[PDB]
Design a protein around this ligand. Structure first.
Ligand SMILES: C#CCN(Cc1ccc2[nH]c(N)nc(=O)c2c1)c1ccc(C(=O)N[C@@H](CCC(=O)O)C(=O)O)cc1
Ligand SMILES: C#CCN(Cc1ccc2[nH]c(N)nc(=O)c2c1)c1ccc(C(=O)N[C@@H](CCC(=O)O)C(=O)O)cc1
Ligand SMILES: *c1cc(=O)[nH]c(=O)n1[C@H]1C[C@H](O)[C@@H](COP(=O)(O)O)O1
Ligand SMILES: O=c1ccn([C@H]2C[C@H](O)[C@@H](COP(=O)(O)O)O2)c(=O)[nH]1
Lengths: 264, 264
């Protein structure tokens, strides 16, 4: 997408070389922001083929409050294998924090349900937020949350959402993260009888790994295609009831996929 | 500053009218970002005289892990009065979360000390983060955090910082928050022997209150001047050892102050 490709160019033009924990090396910039008008089309990258089945299943997984890969395995999704333990556990990552953030008084807060209630009864609120950044549990997590904090906003009957991503693997992760959130926005909007607005992406440490340079320039040499369209074939009684098959993406015609290694 | 004035005009030009919780009404936009190169000067607004004194004491108040306005009163700072209880308590706000984030198991994590140690021992870290958004204590707070989440980043010996502000009173709050964080970056850099980089500000619900229109128009008609320069007189033994007397702003020649009512 224009924005995504423009981001890649920026990191290449302004990036600074950094030694990273994975000892792979990154080219990075700090602070960036882009907006996707969800009414223009579903923001799924076309300059390379993306795996929709993996994106959807991960999101349903998060929504279920799950943090074990069994579910992802049942559906042949292996994007999380490298970080799971012998038992398939990732620790209290996304799913747990979203559905059951533990307070100090022994309670657990379901942030998704809370946000849903706000959108329906207090869409004007200035604090419709979900955070995965649980400082007190960070140490039990296989990996600290990358997409860490998100906020919803309503105006003119449209639902917008802004995500703050503390660390971003531009080539590999970003396309996934973007599609995932836009998907969540459509689902929330459908549950609240709202129209979809903008998805705003804000990044902290935004980088390209050293071993993704050729893939990046290959991609950059391509012209984006018309954005695909998302069709939801049903209206479940709750945001927790969606199924993989309720979704249909139409008119997705991307360029060929580009394989790249992930840094552990 | 040009950036500040530009954001002000954008809100008037594109803002949507909202009925806020105070019942005052706001002109609102969602998602915005601005960058301040700290090398170019301290970002203290010049088109309106600002009071560095209340800005400094609040910051120092935070770094002490304090939630009682007592200390602020000791210093003639009255900005938090409307929200304190009969005892002067605000609940586990900023200070408490910065210095003693409570774990579900009874422990506390000191995020400032953590961040100090990260900048010193692992400056390349992609997770040098401080969060005040403790989902489990929001209902105990007198006011949910506005400047909710911040991240530090180091590149070529420079210290940059990004703040995510979920709610922003553009006229009254913003100038204060920008100086506060700029100030913080200068202290961290000094304690960590780094140069100052960029201060990146990202907002969620960014608004102007209805009863701030006159002041806004007045301000929008003034020309910004060169930014001052921040001077630190002594290098304390620790980030928790600074005092009001340690900072000196130099070359600050702002237009006259503008009075505006606070929306409570
Ligand atoms: C973001 C996120 C979720 N996750 C979590 C996740 C976990 C660790 C990470 N680690 C790093 N260094 N970068 C990441 O992007 C990353 C992402 C993903 C993991 C892998 C792929 C990846 O391998 N995609 C490949 C293969 C696609 C497939 O098997 O379906 C692709 O070519 O896109 C995508 C997302
Ligand atoms: C942000 C923040 C911190 N705080 C906390 C705080 C709490 C609630 C708020 N509520 C609203 N609607 N806007 C705010 O900016 C705001 C700020 C502030 C409180 C008020 C002032 C305000 O009175 N500014 C005066 C200062 C004059 C003086 O120094 O005494 C001014 O006219 O500039 C500034 C900051
Ligand atoms: C993480 C997960 C995700 O959903 N998206 C991402 O882009 N990533 C990336 C960010 C970064 O490259 C790395 C995480 O490691 P660290 O804790 O920052 O060392 O995976
Ligand atoms: O440091 C601060 C504190 C508050 N506000 C503003 C944001 C909103 O205008 C309001 C608080 O309302 P809630 O969003 O907390 O309900 O005060 C700021 O800009 N900066």
């Amino acid at each position: 997408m224009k924005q995504y490709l423009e981001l890649m160019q920026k990191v290449l033009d302004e990036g600074t070389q950094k030694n990273d924990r994975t000892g792979t090396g990154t080219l990075s910039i700090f602070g960036h922001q882009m907006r996707f008008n969800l009414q223009d089309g579903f923001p799924l990258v076309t300059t390379k083929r993306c795996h929709l089945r993996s994106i959807i299943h991960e999101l349903l997984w998060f929504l279920q409050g799950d943090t074990n890969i069994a579910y992802l395995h049942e559906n042949n999704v292996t994007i999380w294998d490298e970080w799971a333990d012998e038992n398939g556990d990732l620790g209290p990552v996304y799913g747990k924090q979203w559905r059951a953030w533990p307070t100090p008084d022994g309670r657990h807060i379901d942030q998704i349900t809370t946000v849903l209630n706000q959108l329906k009864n207090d869409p004007d609120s200035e604090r419709i937020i979900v955070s995965a950044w649980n400082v007190g549990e960070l140490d039990k997590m296989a990996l600290a949350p990358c997409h860490a904090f998100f906020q919803f906003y309503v105006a003119d009957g449209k639902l917008s959402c802004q995500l703050y991503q503390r660390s971003c693997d531009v080539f590999l992760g970003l396309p996934f993260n973007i599609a995932s959130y836009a998907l969540l926005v459509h689902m929330m909007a459908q549950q609240c009888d709202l129209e979809v607005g903008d998805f705003v992406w804000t990044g902290g440490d935004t980088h390209l790994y050293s071993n993704h340079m050729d893939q990046t320039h290959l991609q950059l040499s391509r012209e984006p295609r018309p954005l695909p369209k998302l069709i939801i074939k049903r209206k479940p009684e709750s945001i927790f009831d969606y199924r993989f098959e309720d979704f249909e993406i139409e008119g997705y015609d991307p360029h060929p996929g580009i394989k790249a290694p992930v840094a552990i």
